[PDB]
RNA sequence: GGAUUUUUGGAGCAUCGACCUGGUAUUGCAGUACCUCCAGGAACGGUGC
């Protein structure tokens, strides 16, 4: 099975998406598509050796995201 | 189908646009014909080579794999496709 | 009518002729400039034509601003904390003001990144040695009242008031 | 359909990702190398055809130069890694 | 109604510093050609003027802040919570007494 | 869903892969993460390369800009539609 | 001044019945009974407009002890 | 300004309104834990505002002792009152009533039906001080602390149950060394536990509890709080025994015990204070830790579906009938009518009769199609 | 939805834009890359190696 369907079934979860170019955005993921497009609201983004800025809304692409970090209160058996 | 930025880039042919390469070079010229895969064919192009040295080349063709951005002129801002 | 955030949110913000973001606020007659922090540093030029601002003060911390247009007003006094709020100021348009004394331009030398200034149509320019005092106060300004600085004018400014 | 799912199961059990099938058989920790020189040690809970892995109780270690670089590492409870940044996947690590 | 309220507050402040019931700073003002309709008890504003005079008299207490400082109401949240619980218990007792009076009337 | 079309024609800032940020009115988008930013301005930070020099960001306005999806990293909202 | 409001009437009372009951004290020029068109039932109130204000006041003053269907009907000036 | 008369009475009225709002909040019943926590936070904010108002009113007594000699004097009086009445004799052209003299503090200390929040506490939110895993004081988040302990220990042989069993000890032997790098994680865990204890009970006096904890750490924990029957007296900083009380008193002021060690009372005093605060937070909030351990055991023992369920908790009718057509009726105050048939039905109505009775024209059939007042007057005069 | 143009990896030197001084011709109606030339100083900055 594809792993995009497990990531698409995530709403109102405070996750942390680490991008490829040293960027890490931690926030509540509000929308996910089949192309791994992560639309989050009220997130905090920290770049490579930069100050963590805060944004009201962010839309990270699928090819620009490198890794994801989910909370510990998230079962993986029901999402797969 | 065809995308709306792809249709905006195809409708911008015949005017002076400015494509940007992946190595930092910006080539500004008259876009003769465009493609759906961001292929920019421009005449009277001005290459910069990421150092400001703008040389005048003729019949340049930049592929869509290295095309980072495409500055369109302000005359196409009132297009009905963008609404 | 006082200036608030509703007057700044309903104003027309677009691209000016100098390829910069400018918000038009002409025809308001605001007696005091306040609550200008609603732009979230998304503008580079602020126009304040046809205003009744008696003192140029109350400016929030804006780093993206690079041009100030305070022409056609009645500004008699100038604020002192202008360099701490606009560190990237480059253009200053203070034409048609009520400046009479030469000490009003003494906080205006606090801006280190200022290179453009306009103090035309003012009673302070009618006094003697006004341009020499303006050159000796702020040496970083390169264009004063649509005129470039001179080396002989800089020598006369460094020689005078010794 | 069912035949495509059976072909995908055969390609996951007998193909190159069969060592990844060792990650879901005995729940053993695997070592995955990233593009930013960060080695992640941990078992894989879910996988796909595009090498997208779901790691549980993973430890990500890397070398950061302040001199001599130190082995600064972190421990995540649950994480997801895309297949584009995966370089080398080791089934049985040393330690 | 701000001027009438200010005049009533001034009358309550001038009447609270009196040394007698009839020898006040407002009884002599009635004979000094000063029209004050709030001094008569027949008006509806007299009930508010009496409450303002009672508040001005309670503001001159020795634990009201003239010669002493309150420490239980100003430096003890537990005492304020106990006072709020006692006020809630008194309100519940008053509601129970009102319910008993309504049941007796029924 | 339609999460990408909800922020259409607004003053959005998209971060590029090279570190630059293009702020403009994103009027048109596509499935390939393309963006058509009218009156766009691109800002790129420059390295100080010294001990006492500060970090500056050169910003240049281009107008209508067609940004592809291979260079765009993340897009954030910055300002309401005028 | 010549209109009197009658309240406290049941829903079973009709407008010719109210006109015949109001005719015992004086001739009523007009009788308006507001009722809901969705349900077809009256609201228990009506307006009787006579030819003069004195006759309407005499009809409102003499209808203080009227009982219809066990309910007392009240008359007020409107 | 009447700072002793008007300002003190205003502060007393504000304190009485705050006490009445606190009594109305305490008398009302609660149904949820988050709403009760928000009500407790609003009551703590109101108590802090009342304490600030009492501290501001308690300092307005310097000039009162000098003004009480002139205020209580019977020789003065109506002269200054007549001067103040002449000063208050300005223009009364501002015809506007202000009923918000006492109703505005009553409405500011109240809540609405859509949101049970006060007017100073309208911007307060329970999501800005507590996480989703805590549950507004129901449980404690210990995943990040367990991850930090697993990163510091550099071993994957410690699960959540083992970390909960190691964290449950108060006076037992520690799992790591006292002079190691575990104290930097223990200080952060104590700072998190102190914020969790301060967030679980906002109505309690945190300053008095901190002063009592500091007094218990200074007077008791620094003088041998754990007696024995080397085992008679133990030191928390030096981690060494003592034969008797006299030897411990002689070694308490020693040179290795003051600053001649790496775990003396000079540098390792803050770590000992953080350990004492963590022990006090574990002893005071042991029931919350037991509830969090039971919730973690219930989440670990459940399946995937049970964990997912626990984690989720018309123009045609207006054009054919002649509607939407503006018609002016000058008889009934130049009213508007949206139909000819509607105007013909409203002409023989009570409103048109009441409009025509003002001019003196009786309600007849001759004035049915009359619109102007002059034409109706001419038709009434012709008959 | 995984195989060359966009979404599961290639992973001190060269040049341009300015800053300040003198001579020099054009006084001209357009939506434009750019925009006369020479000489002197610079202790201004970006890009790749």
- The C1' atom of I26 and the CA atom of C21 lie apart, in whole Å, by 36
CB contact (8 A) between residue F36 and residue B76: no
CATH code of the domain occupying C1-162: 3.80.10.10
Determine if strand I comes within 7 Å of the CB of D54: no
Q: How far is H303 from chain A (nearest CA, A)?
A: 8
Q: CB < 7 Å to strand I — which of 12-71 in chain B?
A: 16, 24, 28, 35-39, 46, 50-54, 63-65, 67
Residue E81 phi, psi dihedral angles, 5° rounding: -70, -40
Task: Give the chain B residue nearest F67 (alpha carbons).
Answer: B69
Closest CA to H284 of H208, H182, H203, H200: H200
- Residue H76, CA distances (Å) to B4, E15, G23, H145, H278 in order: 88, 13, 77, 72, 65
The minimal CB distance from H72 to the residues E17, E28, E56 is found for E17
Write the DSSP assignment of F24-78 as a string of letters.
EEEEEE-TT--EEEEEEEEEEEE---SSSPPPEEEEEEEEEEEE-TTTEEEEEEE
Closest CA to C33 of C72, C75, C65: C75
How many residues are there in chain B? 83
CATH assignment of the domain containing D24: 2.30.30.100
b/e map of G24-41 (b: 16 or more CB within 10 Å)? ebbebbbeebeeeeeeee
Closest CA to C32 of C1, C68, C66: C1
Closest CA to B8 of D64, F30, E67: F30
Q: How far apart are CA E104 and CA H92, in angstroms?
A: 52
Closest CA to C8 of C53, C38, C42: C38
What SS3 string covers chain C? CCCCHHHHHCCEEEECCCCCEEEECCCCCCCCCCCCHHHCCCCCEEECCCCCCCEECCCCCCCCCCEEECCCCCCCEECCCCCCCCCCCCEEECCCCCCCCHHHHCHHHHCCCCCEEECCCCCCCCCCCHHHHHHHHCCCCCEECCCECCHHHHHHHHHCCC
Chain center to CA of G24? 12
Interface check for H156 against chain D (CB to CB < 8 A): the answer is yes
Is there an interface between C and A (3+ Cβ pairs < 8 A)? no
Closest CA to F28 of C93, B77, H25, C59: B77
Helix (H, G, I), strand (E, B) or coil at B75: helix
Number of domains in chain A: 1
- The C1' atom of I46 and the CA atom of F3 lie apart, in whole Å, by 38
Structural domain for A20, as ranges: 1-80
Q: How far apart are CA D21 and CA D31, in angstroms?
A: 14
Residue C89 phi, psi dihedral angles, 5° rounding: -75, 135
Structure token pair of residue H293? 């351990």
CB contact (8 A) between residue A25 and residue F7: no
Q: How far apart are CA C10 and CA B72, in angstroms?
A: 29
Structure token pair of residue C35? 């609550």
Structure token pair of residue H145? 């602390």
Interface check for H101 against chain D (CB to CB < 8 A): the answer is no
Radius of gyration of chain E (CA): 20
Structure token pair of residue C134? 């303006």
CB contact (8 A) between residue F64 and residue B38: no
CB contact (8 A) between residue F66 and residue B82: no
Q: Taking the CB of residue C11, how many other CB atoms lie within 10 A of it?
A: 15
Tell me the HSE value of D58 on the side-chain side, using a 13 A CA sphere: 29
Q: How far from each other are the two terminal CA atoms of chain A, in whole angstroms?
A: 8
Closest CA to H3 of H59, H87, H48: H59
Q: How far apart are CA H337 and CA C127, in angstroms?
A: 73
Q: How far is G70 from chain H (nearest CA, A)?
A: 31
Q: How far is A79 from chain F (nearest CA, A)?
A: 19
Is there an interface between A and F (3+ Cβ pairs < 8 A)? yes
Closest CA to H263 of H183, H196, H203, H369: H183
Indicate the fold that domain B2-83 takes in CATH: SH3 type barrels. (2.30.30)
Residue A5 phi, psi dihedral angles, 5° rounding: -75, -30
Q: Taking the CB of residue H74, how many other CB atoms lie within 10 A of it?
A: 12
Q: How far apart are CA H129 and CA A4, in angstroms?
A: 33
Q: Which nucleotides of I are covered by protein (CB under 7 A)?
A: 1-2, 4-9, 11, 14-17, 19-22, 32-33, 45-48
- Residue H197, CA distances (Å) to H146, H193, H209 in order: 19, 6, 11
Closest CA to C145 of C125, C162, C126: C125
Chain center to CA of F5? 16
Closest CA to A4 of D24, D52, F30, D5: D52
Q: How far apart are CA C153 and CA C149, in angstroms?
A: 7
Structural domain for F34, as ranges: 1-82
Tell me the Ramachandran region of residue E54: left when phi exceeds 0, alpha when psi lies from -120 to 50, beta otherwise: alpha
State how beta strands C116-118 and C91-93 pair: parallel
DSSP state of E102: H
Task: Give the chain H residue nearest G31 (alpha carbons).
Answer: H350
DSSP state of H327: E
Q: How far apart are CA B48 and CA B52, in angstroms?
A: 5
Alpha helices, H only, chain H: 6-27, 33-58, 64-71, 78-87, 103-108, 143-153, 160-167, 182-200, 206-219, 245-252, 255-258, 269-284, 286-301, 304-311, 315-320, 340-347, 350-356, 373-382
Q: How far apart are CA D80 and CA D87, in angstroms?
A: 15
Structure token pair of residue E76? 């003890």
Sequence-distant (6+) residues with CB within 8 A of C161 are: C133, C136
Domain locations in chain C?
1-162
Q: Taking the CB of residue H87, how many other CB atoms lie within 10 A of it?
A: 8
Structure token pair of residue D47? 């996988």
Instruction: Show the beta-strand stretches assigned E in chain A.
Output: 13-19, 24-32, 38-46, 53-60, 65-70
DSSP state of H21: H
Alpha helices, H only, A1-80: 4-8
Instruction: Show the beta-strand stretches assigned E in chain B.
Output: 16-20, 26-34, 40-43, 45-47, 55-57, 60-62, 69-72
Interface chains of chain C (3 or more CB pairs under 8 Å): F
Structure token pair of residue A57? 């809304």
Closest CA to C126 of C91, C97, C155, C159: C97
Structure token pair of residue H123? 């911007």
Q: How far apart are CA H63 and CA H165, in angstroms?
A: 62
G2 - beta bridge partners? Answer: none
State how beta strands C143-144 and C116-118 pair: parallel
Structure token pair of residue G37? 């068109």
The residue behind tokens 């009592």 is H212
What is the number of helices (H) and of strands (E) in chain G? 2, 7
Task: State which approach was used to obtain the coordinates.
Answer: cryo-EM
Q: With contacts defined as CB-CB under 8 Å, which chain H residues touch D59?
A: 151, 156
The residue behind tokens 């400082």 is E69
Structure token pair of residue B32? 């003769």
Q: How far apart are CA A54 and CA C40, in angstroms?
A: 13
Structure token pair of residue H159? 């699960």
b/e map of C57-83 (b: 16 or more CB within 10 Å)? bebeebebbbbbbbbebebeebbeebb
State how beta strands C55-56 and C67-69 pair: unpaired
How many residues are there in chain E? 106
Interface check for B28 against chain F (CB to CB < 8 A): the answer is no
């Amino acid at each position: 099975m594809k792993l995009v369907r497990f990531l698409m079934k995530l709403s109102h979860e405070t996750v942390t998406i680490e991008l490829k170019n040293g960027t890490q955005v931690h926030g509540t993921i509000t929308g996910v598509d089949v192309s791994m497009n992560t639309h989050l609201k009220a997130v905090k983004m920290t770049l490579k050796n930069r100050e963590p800025v805060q944004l009201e809304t962010l839309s990270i692409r699928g090819n620009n995201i490198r890794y994801f970090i989910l909370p510990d209160s998230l079962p993986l058996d029901t999402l797969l | 189908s065809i995308g709306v930025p792809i249709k905006v880039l195809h409708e911008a042919e015949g005017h002076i646009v400015t494509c940007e390469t992946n190595t930092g070079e910006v080539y500004r010229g008259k876009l003769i014909e465009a493609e759906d895969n961001m292929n920019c064919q421009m005449s009277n192009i001005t290459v910069t080579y990421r150092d400001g040295r703008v040389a005048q080349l003729e019949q340049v063709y930049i592929r869509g794999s290295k095309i980072r951005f495409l500055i369109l002129p302000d005359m196409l801002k009132n297009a009905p496709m963008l609404k | 009518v006082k200036l608030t955030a509703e007057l700044i949110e309903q104003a027309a913000q677009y691209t000016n002729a100098v390829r910069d973001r400018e918000l038009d606020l002409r025809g308001y007659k605001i007696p005091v400039i306040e609550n200008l922090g609603a732009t979230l540093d998304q503008f580079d030029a602020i126009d304040f034509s046809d205003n009744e601002i008696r003192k140029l003060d109350g400016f929030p911390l804006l780093r993206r601003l690079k041009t100030l247009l305070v022409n056609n007003n009645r500004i008699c006094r100038i604020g002192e904390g202008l360099d701490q709020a606009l560190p990237c100021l480059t253009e200053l348009i203070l034409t048609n003001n009520s400046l009479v004394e030469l000490g009003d331009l003494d906080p205006l030398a606090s801006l280190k990144s200022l290179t453009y200034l306009s103090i035309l149509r003012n009673p302070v320019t009618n006094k003697k040695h006004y341009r020499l005092y303006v050159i000796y106060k702020v040496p970083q300004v390169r264009v004063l009242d649509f005129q470039k600085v001179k080396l002989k004018e800089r020598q006369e400014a460094e020689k005078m008031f010794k | 359909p069912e035949e495509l799912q059976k072909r995908e199961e055969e390609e996951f059990n007998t193909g190159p990702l069969s060592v990844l099938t060792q990650s879901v058989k005995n729940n053993t920790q695997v070592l995955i190398n990233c593009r930013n020189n960060k080695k992640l040690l941990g078992r894989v809970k879910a996988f796909d055809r595009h090498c997208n892995m779901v790691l549980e109780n993973v430890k990500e270690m890397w070398t950061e130069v302040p001199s001599k670089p130190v082995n600064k590492d972190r421990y995540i409870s649950k994480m997801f890694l895309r297949g584009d940044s995966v370089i080398v996947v080791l089934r049985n690590p040393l330690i | 109604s701000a001027f009438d309220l200010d005049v009533v507050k001034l009358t309550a402040q001038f009447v609270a510093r009196n040394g007698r019931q009839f020898l006040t700073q407002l009884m002599q003002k009635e004979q000094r050609n000063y029209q004050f309709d709030f001094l008569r008890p027949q008006h509806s504003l007299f009930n508010y003027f009496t409450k303002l005079v009672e508040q001005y008299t309670k503001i001159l207490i020795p634990p009201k802040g003239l010669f002493s400082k309150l420490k239980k109401e100003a430096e003890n949240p537990r005492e304020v919570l106990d006072q709020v619980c006692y006020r809630v218990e008194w309100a519940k007792f008053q509601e129970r007494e009102r319910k008993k009076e309504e049941e007796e009337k029924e | 869903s339609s999460k990408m079309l909800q922020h259409i024609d607004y003053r959005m800032r998209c971060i590029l892969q090279d570190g630059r940020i293009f702020i403009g009115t994103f009027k048109a988008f596509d499935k390939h993460m393309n963006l058509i930013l009218c009156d766009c301005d691109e800002f790129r930070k420059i390295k100080p390369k010294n001990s006492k020099q500060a970090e500056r960001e050169e910003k240049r306005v281009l107008g209508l800009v067609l940004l592809r999806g291979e260079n765009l990293v993340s897009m954030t909202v910055e300002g309401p539609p005028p | 001044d010549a209109t009197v409001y009658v309240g406290g009437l049941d829903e079973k009372v009709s407008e010719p019945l109210l006109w015949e009951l109001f005719l015992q004290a004086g001739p009523v020029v007009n009788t308006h009974m507001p009722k809901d068109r969705v349900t077809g039932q009256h609201q228990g109130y009506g307006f009787v407009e006579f030819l003069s204000e004195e006759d309407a006041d005499y009809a409102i003053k003499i209808m203080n002890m009227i009982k219809l269907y066990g309910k007392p009907i009240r008359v007020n000036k409107a | 300004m009447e700072t002793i008369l008007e300002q003190q009475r205003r502060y007393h009225e504000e304190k009485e309104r705050l006490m009445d709002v606190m009594a109305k909040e305490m008398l009302t019943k609660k149904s949820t834990l988050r709403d009760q926590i928000n009500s407790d936070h609003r009551t703590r904010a109101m108590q802090d505002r009342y304490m600030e108002v009492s501290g501001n009113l308690r300092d307005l007594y310097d000039d009162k002792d000098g003004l009480r000699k002139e205020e209580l004097n019977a020789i003065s009086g109506p002269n200054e009152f007549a001067e103040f009445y002449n000063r208050l004799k300005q223009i009364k052209e501002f015809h506007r009533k202000h009923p918000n003299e006492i109703c505005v503090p009553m409405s500011v200390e109240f809540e609405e039906l859509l949101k049970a929040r006060e007017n100073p506490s309208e911007e307060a939110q329970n999501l800005v001080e507590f996480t989703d895993e805590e549950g507004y004081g129901r449980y404690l988040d210990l995943h990040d602390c367990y991850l930090k302990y697993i990163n510091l220990k550099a071993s994957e042989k410690l699960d959540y149950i083992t970390y909960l069993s190691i964290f449950d000890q108060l006076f037992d032997i520690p799992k790591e060394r006292k002079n190691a790098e575990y104290k930097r994680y223990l200080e952060m865990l104590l700072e998190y536990l102190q914020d969790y204890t301060d967030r679980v009970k906002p109505l309690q006096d945190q300053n008095e509890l901190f002063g009592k904890i500091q007094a218990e750490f200074e007077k008791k924990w620094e003088n041998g709080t754990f007696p024995g029957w080397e085992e008679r007296a133990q030191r928390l900083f030096s981690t060494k025994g003592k034969s008797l009380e006299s030897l411990d008193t002689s070694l308490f002021a020693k040179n290795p015990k003051s600053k001649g060690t790496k775990r003396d009372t000079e540098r390792n005093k803050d770590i000992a204070f953080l350990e004492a605060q963590i022990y006090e937070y574990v002893e005071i909030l042991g029931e919350q830790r037991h509830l969090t351990h039971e919730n973690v055991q219930r989440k670990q023992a459940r399946t995937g579906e049970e964990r997912e369920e626990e984690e989720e908790e018309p123009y045609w009718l207006y054009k054919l009938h002649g509607l939407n057509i503006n018609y002016n009726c000058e008889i009934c105050g130049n009213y508007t009518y949206r139909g000819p048939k509607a105007f013909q039905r409203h002409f023989a109505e009570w409103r048109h009769a009441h409009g025509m009775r003002c001019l003196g024209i009786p309600n007849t059939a001759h004035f049915a199609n009359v619109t102007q007042i002059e034409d109706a007057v001419s038709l009434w005069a012709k008959l």
